[PDB]
Design a protein around this ligand. Structure first.
Ligand code: 3PE
Ligand code: 3PE
Ligand code: 3PE
Ligand code: 3PE
Ligand code: 3PE
Ligand code: 3PE
Lengths: 504, 598
């Protein structure tokens, strides 16, 4: 019953940031902090109240807390929310990254910050609704309604050093990609609903009703193909990945849009929740293609990330490679691989959040992002080079950080299922270390290659240092003690895996 | 002895304090924090050894918590302590304490002092984790921490780019070896279902009865990880390059931490290699080839640090030869003694570099035996221990045990390769001694430990590693006499060429085959060239070819098609009315024809 409020209080908070903007320029940031603190507090309350550690697996469906309201009764469409361990973990991560995004844009005294904050929490409420909703039309509605504030923020509030045409082009490319993939997902959803109506005779858009749908082979393959095309653009999966570095590079220079918008990957949650249980046989047949797409994504993203002269573009390609690892993890049908996938998504979100925040602050210090114009920056700032060294160490899969735990349980489950893809992915981890070292050496080590890197730069303030140290502590605790996270998602992942491997 | 985790906690606390100090502390207080952390770790290690020998020499287990638990996959954060672990922990803590206080003397007046001590504290903590790991995953955590600290300490002077290139190359080859180690971990968990060493030993013969191929793959992958970490064939190409960093980090890497990890990995997993004897013989062959290659590479070298690099690689190959001839006690004894004399030689080489205004070319400096006598004496005893000088050093006893274990098990070729390597190492070490030197508390302690006093210390390996088969006493004496004669003949022959004015050296060195062999062995037998031209250059070529993002343009093709089609269709809207009526007539004809054909 707290889930409708969990979606709503970001929207009410964004409306309050827009409305209380007339009270002063410095007011809506405080309102946004209060409402994201409240959203994170309710997510943690659901974590402490759900009892996720001692929960068994009763089969799909098994929701810890659900909500029903009729929305379009003509089609049997409901505002239908449901939370379990995986959804709760992603909602907590959403609240954390939303708090970090609000804190990261604290130094803006611009004239129209109210609409910036309104679009930010519209994005946050949309992605929270994607995680919570299981009704197909409502899930699709959140999936495409979180898209408009992303476009507006990238186009209007984006990177000030670039022209308006480049920001407009990047935003339009991202919007066209994501909304066309939403449209083909809607085609798959509609065809699934019509197949269920022809089988039974009742208008159901509900996720639990669509599971017991008899489909011939070939139709289910096409529905799975539409779902995978949507979740492949949104992952990203190559070659459907060109929107990601363009949207990251022309994002706002504070860095809040990267954390709130794209750094929570709804596509892998959609694959775990919708692509695998609704289409078990089609996904089992598609597993070689998806796993080889993951291999190509890992190596392609590494080869991009080594060859980028832009640090933000580099981190975007790190995201491409890590989500290629997650894509390999999804299509194995293993308990250990799925749990490693969950750990890898959480750790990648935290590590890329730290990397994006530190890159934004580096750009604020030095007023450039080209990696050929900077060097020897370890002796020029106080805290930023060491923290970026820690996060670049985290992103290459280092023990003591959750990335190693997630990637290694992914590889253990995969090698239990397929060995060759596992060994090629481990060489992809070698490539990941290569690009992380290249970024570190071309960014902070060496001699000064320009004049802006030859002078002493001001240090980071207390707020940004506190949030970066919070991310560091969270990554260390995830790496050294991931057991509460594994026990939180043990029931839902087990239900999904049992549904996937028991129907084939 | 309940303070086993303190040897991890105290270096971690020292690293955290020195990292968050950010150099604002003075040199005295930061040095006190770092070397006091390592010294307290060493004192806790001494107490652990005392209560280990006061409890009947029994393996102890301290399970701190559970790392991860996904169904059957149960991996725990448990520490273990046996004679091998006690020996490794003792040598790591003691040699690290000596190197740490010598670095406290050495790094004075240098930027990154607190950063240096934090990185070395993290190095010590990660290696204590490595040697006190109950399972392969915590061992992999210590492995990765040791590799990261090696990367962070080799490129310590970040301003000069060749330090950074050396650190990056070392991290890349170690990550490749650790990916091979990860392959071993995946195979072992897939077959046996556990990563704990003891349970793997128990359930290995029960599971691999009718099939013994995946076990051979797992042991081969373990050997690949070991040769990646210990700089052996074929992943030895980072050592001499990665001595671009400061001296105490080099002493820590080559004496105790970086190169002995693979030896400890092979020794700890001795049962799995014992049930796959072909892989063990491959370990011995790899060690023999690497020690001979390292000797021939250290022949023609002109830098003292690279000479010590290939000497370290030669003794690591000696240890791998000992492990391949089922001589485990000899291997660990050689590990401890090599740690002692190589730490002494590296610290004295750093003293030489500081005394000779940061000059590293051995041919520039000469007649240094009378400028400073104490460092010359330490270098003499370190070379004598490294050359296996009989009856007074510890390296002689270590190599004698290694070759006795090689001969007693029927490996005549490996024993011959060991004798050639002993001749080789005596020759190049006293070549370097005579080129450099002719033409205080850690140093004293390591000088004492470099002699037979260090040979008096025996590791408590009874009950953990299997006993080496005893050689006959007459053949044992024959082997000892042959090894001593070989070392003495090599030392006298090196004195014949290099102590006097060089006649035969320049006669064959300036010849075209001689110059060809010298240039071949100077570049480590052309392995860096092969790895640059086989693995690095295609990587840069593919990166440069792909930097335009060809898949992005492939998916941007239909946008270009849509733009072209729209611009083509907009030409039909010319604005003429008669054309509009003609187009209406054309459409009427088209729809009528389509209705008639169906
Ligand atoms: C897995 C493959 C099969 C399934 C595919 C399912 C569909 C979803 C996933 C694929 C989406 C592909 C989108 C490609 C276009 C992305 C946007 C883009 O590149 O825009 C570039 C450009 C606007 O940028 P700008 O430089 O400002 O304009 C030029 C100035 N005249 O744009 C323009 O100038 C015009 C843009 C027009 C609208 C975009 C083109 C859409 C054409 C239909 C594509 C349908 C999918 C076809 C199959 C995949 C591609 C082979
Ligand atoms: C460019 C962007 C847009 C993408 C392209 C546009 C969409 C293309 C969709 C192609 C669909 C091809 C279907 C081929 C077979 C049609 C005839 C047939 O036999 O259909 C089977 C069935 C109707 O027969 P029925 O008796 O209902 O059998 C169901 C038994 N359970 O049929 C049904 O019950 C319904 C079958 C629906 C099949 C899936 C359609 C959507 C697939 C996802 C989007 C396209 C792929 C990406
Ligand atoms: C199982 C036991 C362990 C076994 C081995 C485990 C190995 C894996 C874990 C690796 C952890 C990260 C290692 C790399 C850290 C790199 C950063 C660093 O050391 O920076 C040094 C820097 C001080 O350098 P300095 O040159 O003096 O700076 C002056 C100008 N800035 O420092 C600074 O500027 C300030 C500090 C920067 C960040 C330091 C590292 C932070 C992460 C670890 C501590 C987290 C907090 C402790 C609590 C965790 C939760 C309980
Ligand atoms: C060195 C390794 C740590 C490296 C730095 C990272 C900080 C520590 C992060 C992991 C914390 C793990 C932890 O506290 O786990 C909880 C555990 C009790 O949980 P459980 O596994 O159920 O144990 C049963 C109790 N007998 O708690 C315990 O078992 C209590 C004792 C745990 C061992 C000491 C924990 C602190 C070590 C770092 C100190 C600085
Ligand atoms: C022999 C049998 C066993 C084989 C095992 C597998 C192969 C092992 C290969 C080992 C390679 C060792 C050499 C690596 C050196 C890397 C460090 C280096 O030298 O960097 C130099 C250069 C610095 O430049 P950079 O920082 O990139 O900035 C651009 C401005 N110059 O940076 C560069 O040029 C970047 C170089 C990156 C090299 C990546 C190599 C990846 C190898 C993957 C192998 C997969 C096998 C399956
Ligand atoms: C059976 C295996 C025997 C191995 C030991 C052989 C000992 C004798 C030859 C090596 C000593 C020698 O003559 O070294 C000379 C030269 C290297 O001396 P170097 O210090 O580099 O020269 C300074 C000149 N400015 O050496 C060279 O330039 C290369 C000499 C190669 C001699 C043949 C080696 C065949 C194997």
């Amino acid at each position: 019953m707290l889930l409708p409020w969990l979606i709503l209080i970001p929207f009410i908070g964004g409306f309050l940031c827009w409305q209380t903007e007339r009270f002063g320029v410095k007011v809506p940031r405080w309102i946004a902090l209060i409402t994201m603190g409240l959203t994170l507090a309710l997510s943690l309350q659901l974590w402490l109240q759900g009892g996720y550690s001692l929960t068994q697996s009763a089969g799909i469906p098994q929701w810890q807390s659900e909500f029903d309201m009729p929305w379009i009764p003509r089609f049997g469409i409901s505002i239908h929310l449901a939370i379990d361990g995986l959804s709760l973990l992603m909602v907590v991560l959403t609240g954390l990254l939303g708090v970090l995004a609000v804190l990261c844009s604290w130094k803006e005294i611009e004239k129209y910050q109210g609409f910036f904050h309104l679009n930010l929490m519209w994005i946050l409420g949309g992605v929270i609704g994607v995680f919570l909703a299981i009704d197909m039309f409502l899930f699709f509605f959140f999936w495409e309604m979180m898209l408009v504030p992303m476009y507006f923020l990238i186009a209007l509030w984006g990177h000030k050093a670039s022209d308006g045409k480049t920001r407009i082009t990047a935003a339009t490319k991202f919007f066209i990609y994501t909304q066309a993939s939403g449209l083909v997902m809607l085609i798959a959803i509609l065809a699934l609903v019509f197949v269920h109506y022809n089988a039974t005779g009742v208008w159901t858009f509900n996720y639990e009703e669509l599971l017991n749908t008899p489909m011939s082979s070939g139709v289910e393959y096409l529905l799975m193909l539409g779902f995978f095309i949507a979740f492949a653009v949104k992952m990203p999966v190559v070659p459907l990945h060109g929107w990601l570095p363009d949207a990251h590079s022309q994002a706002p220079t504070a860095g809040s849009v990267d954390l709130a918008g794209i750094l929570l990957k709804t596509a892998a949650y959609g694959l775990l929740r919708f692509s695998l249980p609704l289409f078990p046989n089609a996904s089992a047949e598609f597993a070689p293609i998806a796993m080889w797409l993951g291999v190509i994504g890992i190596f392609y993203g590494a080869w991009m990330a080594f060859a980028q002269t832009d640090i933000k573009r580099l981190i975007a390609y790190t995201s491409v490679s890590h989500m290629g690892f997650v894509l390999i993890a999804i299509y194995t049908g293993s308990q250990l691989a799925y749990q490693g996938a969950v750990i890898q998504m959480i750790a990648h979100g935290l590590s890329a959040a730290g990397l994006f925040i530190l890159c934004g602050q580096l750009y604020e210090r030095i007023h450039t992002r080209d990696m050929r114009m900077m060097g020897g920056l370890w002796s020029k700032m106080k805290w930023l080079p060491a923290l970026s060294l820690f996060f670049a160490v985290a992103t290459l899969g280092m023990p003591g950080t959750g990335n190693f735990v997630g990637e290694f349980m992914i590889l253990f489950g995969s090698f239990q299922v397929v060995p060759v893809i596992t060994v090629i992915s481990t060489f992809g981890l070698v490539f990941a270390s290569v690009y992380s070292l290249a970024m570190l050496h071309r960014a902070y080590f060496g001699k000064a290659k320009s004049q802006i890197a030859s002078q002493e730069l001001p240090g980071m303030s207390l707020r940004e240092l506190f949030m970066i140290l919070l991310l560091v502590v969270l990554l260390v605790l995830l790496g050294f003690y991931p057991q509460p996270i594994l026990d939180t998602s043990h029931s839902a992942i087990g239900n999904i895996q049992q549904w996937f491997v028991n129907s084939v | 002895m309940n303070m086993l985790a303190l040897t991890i906690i105290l270096p971690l606390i020292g690293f955290v304090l020195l990292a968050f100090s950010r150099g604002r502390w003075s040199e005295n207080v930061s040095a006190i924090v770092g070397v006091g952390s390592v010294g307290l770790a060493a004192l806790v290690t001494a107490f652990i050894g005392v209560d280990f020998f006061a409890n009947g020499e029994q393996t102890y287990s301290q399970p701190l918590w559970t790392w991860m638990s996904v169904g059957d996959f149960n991996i725990g954060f448990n520490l273990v302590l046996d004679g091998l672990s006690l020996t490794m922990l003792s040598v790591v803590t003691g040699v690290g304490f000596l190197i740490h206080m010598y670095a406290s003397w050495y790094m004075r007046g240098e930027e990154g002092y607190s950063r240096f001590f934090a990185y070395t504290n993290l190095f010590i903590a990660s290696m204590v984790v490595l040697v006190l790991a109950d399972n392969l995953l915590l061992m992999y955590l210590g492995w990765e921490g040791v590799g990261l600290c090696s990367y962070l300490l080799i490129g310590f002077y970040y301003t000069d780019p060749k330090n950074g290139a050396a650190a990056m190359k070392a991290f890349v080859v170690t990550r490749v070896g650790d990916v091979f180690l990860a392959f071993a971990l995946f195979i072992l968990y897939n077959e046996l279902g556990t990563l704990n060493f003891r349970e793997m030993v128990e359930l290995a013969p029960a599971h691999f009865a009718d099939g013994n191929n995946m076990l051979m793959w797992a042991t081969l992958m373990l050997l690949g990880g070991a040769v990646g970490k210990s700089a052996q064939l074929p992943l030895q190409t980072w050592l001499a390059d990665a001595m671009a960093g400061p001296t105490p980090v080099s002493a820590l890497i080559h004496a105790a931490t970086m190169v002995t990890a693979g030896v400890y990995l092979i020794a700890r997993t001795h049962g799995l290699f014992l049930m796959t004897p072909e892989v063990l013989h491959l370990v011995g062959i790899v060690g023999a080839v690497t020690l001979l290659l390292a000797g021939f590479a250290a022949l023609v070298q002109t830098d003292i640090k690279r000479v010590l690099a290939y000497s370290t690689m030669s003794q690591i190959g000696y240890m791998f030869l000992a492990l391949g001839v089922q001589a485990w006690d000899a291997a660990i004894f050689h590990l401890m003694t090599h740690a002692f004399f190589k730490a002494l030689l590296f610290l004295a080489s750093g003293s030489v570099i500081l005394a000779c205004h940061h000059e590293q070319n051995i041919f520039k400096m000469g007649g240094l035996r009378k400028s400073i006598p104490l460092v010359y004496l330490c270098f003499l005893v370190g070379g004598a221990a490294l050359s296996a000088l009989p009856l007074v050093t510890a390296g002689f006893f270590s190599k004698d045990e290694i070759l006795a274990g090689a001969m007693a098990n029927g490996h005549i070729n490996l024993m011959v390769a060991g004798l050639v390597g002993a001749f080789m190492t005596s020759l190049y070490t006293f070549r370097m001694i005579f080129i450099v030197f002719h033409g205080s508390l850690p140093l004293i302690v390591l000088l004492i430990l470099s002699t037979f006093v260090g040979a008096l210390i025996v590791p408590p390996l009874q009950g953990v590693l299997p006993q080496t088969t005893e050689l006959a006493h007459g053949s044992m004496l024959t082997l000892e006499i042959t090894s001593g004669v070989v070392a003495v003949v090599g030392i006298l022959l090196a004195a014949w060429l290099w102590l006097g004015k060089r006649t035969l050296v320049t006669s064959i060195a300036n010849s075209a085959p001689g110059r060809l062999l010298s240039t071949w062995w100077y570049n480590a037998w052309g392995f860096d060239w092969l790895y640059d031209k086989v693995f690095v250059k295609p990587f840069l070529g593919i990166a440069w070819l792909l930097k335009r993002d060809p898949l992005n343009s492939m998916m941007n093709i239909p946008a270009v098609l849509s733009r072209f089609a729209g611009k083509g269709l907009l030409l039909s809207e010319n604005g003429y009315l008669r054309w509009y009526v003609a187009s209406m007539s054309i459409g009427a004809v088209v729809v009528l024809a389509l209705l008639m054909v169906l």
